Amino acid sequence: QPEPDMITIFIGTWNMGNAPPPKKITSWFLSKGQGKTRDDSADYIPHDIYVIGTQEDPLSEKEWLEILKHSLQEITSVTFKTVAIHTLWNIRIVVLAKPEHENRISHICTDNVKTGIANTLGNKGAVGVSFMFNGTSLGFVNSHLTSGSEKKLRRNQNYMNILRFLALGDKKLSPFNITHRFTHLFWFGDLNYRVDLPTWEAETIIQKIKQQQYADLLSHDQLLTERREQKVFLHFEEEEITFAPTYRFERLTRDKYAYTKQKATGMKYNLPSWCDRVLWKSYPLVHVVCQSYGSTSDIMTSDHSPVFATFEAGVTSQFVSKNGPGTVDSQGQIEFLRCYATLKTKSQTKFYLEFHSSCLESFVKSQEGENEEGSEGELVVKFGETLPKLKPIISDPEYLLDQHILISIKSSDSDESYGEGCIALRLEATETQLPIYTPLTHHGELTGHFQGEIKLQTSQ
């Protein structure tokens, strides 16, 4: 029975509005409704993994698991296995997988982050799950960010707190936050970004939605504008939105948006918005294709509609050779030529690099670089031809070309990371000097760049 080189992943996000679900929620898991929807001819084909994020979820874990499993069994005639479930307040994540995957999934981690301080600590934050699927690391974040049209900067702060403090994946990757720990990271939830148009325009917005004319609304969506200005979700992807705003509906229909200020809303307007989102970030040159992104039309218990997204994702096998794991394969090596880091810092410490990868027995520390002053005021740290030669555990090109090297540039004075990035080994050539590049981030914000050349030797 061969190991897969691809899987499909379902991501769902639903703010349930503290109400129990209706009897039938299969349309969610089938990717049916508005937007980019799934072909009817796929309805009986199970996804490999289903990841369900809820917010304002009133159910017990047991109650929701029974609904989810019975839903999937009705669709697919498969009894899914529970990989993980984790709840913070009314924010919940469930991961279900085909039974055939039970002995492909390991290293299951869960965590949560509570956002805010005093007044604003007690209901917002995030839950997450990570695991290995054979040779591939997968991370999943369900966040419920701060509400309200005039709190976009709070939402951005919530995002940075969650990616700093959510403890998922391989703890040995100590310089790296969740935005670098996984082959594929999916981040979804009630992100709560709004369409920033004047309150007076509510009925005009409703008109546009009825005409399925979303362009003049999406051009004001706070998540798209904050992402374009590099204020949040740097280096994440989102499929184009082609479904109506998923908030705020009158319950028990989808015919009416309930936007006007009420005591129940704190006298705030809730103009129709795409609060409910799915984004992802995968390592460079790994296959990831969004195959659906939309909302259901027939689940009406909440003031939000459920959102679905599905993906094809590349995975690799748990590779064994006669040498690695448990030794190096001296027929393999990774060399860096003419490498330099460009950093936005004002500091003047010496810096060194750390190279982390599951193709190495353990991480590798470089010598300190040579600081120069860049023409436009920046710090340039030169490594020249000084970087250590990396010794992968396995030399087979079928394995090595699928790997990635995480790079941290650290202060010699504090050993703190000033920037993290990732280089793919999926090169155009082996035994050939080739350009490499990654942006560097710290706490998910841009701090610099790393560029140079690589020379990869495989057994072939």
Ligand SMILES: O=C(COc1ccccc1)Nc1cccc(F)c1
């Ligand atoms: O241990 C587990 C997960 O089971 C639990 C235990 C407690 C709460 C939630 C889930 N293994 C597992 C591994 C691979 C695939 C799979 F479907 C399941």
